[PDB]
Structure 1
Amino acid sequence: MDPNTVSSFQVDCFLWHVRKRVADQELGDAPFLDRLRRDQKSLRGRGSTLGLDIETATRAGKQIVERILK
């Protein structure tokens, strides 16, 4: 696998999860929710193409984000 393809997928998965939690807390406006829906479909297609699992990639993206924010 191309390293940056995988890391970008992982980060994108984690950031989608963050956005979902924001939406769950009733903080999203209608466009924010529209983007959440579009991006869920996008990540599903990307995940399938890569043979990777979004839930697993989410944990990896969390690790990456935690590293770069310290």
Structure 2
Amino acid sequence: MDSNTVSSFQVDCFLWHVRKRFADQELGDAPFLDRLRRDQKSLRGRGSTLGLDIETATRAGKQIVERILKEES
């Protein structure tokens, strides 16, 4: 069973939704949309392998970013 490859996929799903909340608001310049297209198909094709839905993983990792930083101390 894979626990630390599923938490590094759930946090990358949240960090990509933080970057697609930045691109869909037109924050940054034009090369940020160039960088997004290449890695959007790469992050979602990595979802097929370990078998997790990207929208539910963007939400499950949200709790695992928020709570793991209030956890640290």
What TM-score, normalized to structure 2?
A: 0.84
Rg larger in structure? 2
Alignment partners' CA distance in 2, 1:18 and 1:64: 14
Could you list the per-position Cα deviations for residues 35-70 of structure 1 after superposition, in whole angstroms to 9, with x for gaps in the alignment? 211221111111000111101111111011101333
Q: How many residues align?
A: 70
Could you list the per-position Cα deviations for residues 10-59 of structure 1 after superposition, in whole angstroms to 9, with x for gaps in the alignment? 00001111110101111132222222112211111110001111011111
Alignment partners' CA distance in 2, 1:2 and 1:51: 12
**Secondary structure at the counterpart of residue 28 of structure 2:** coil
Q: What is the percentage of aligned positions where both structures have the same residue?
A: 97
Task: List alignment gaps of at least 5 residues for structure 2.
Answer: none
What TM-score, normalized to structure 1?
A: 0.87
Alignment root-mean-square deviation, CA: 1.3
Conserved 8 A contact 1:11-1:64? yes
Conserved 8 A contact 1:13-1:61? yes
Greater helix fraction, Structure 1 or Structure 2? 1
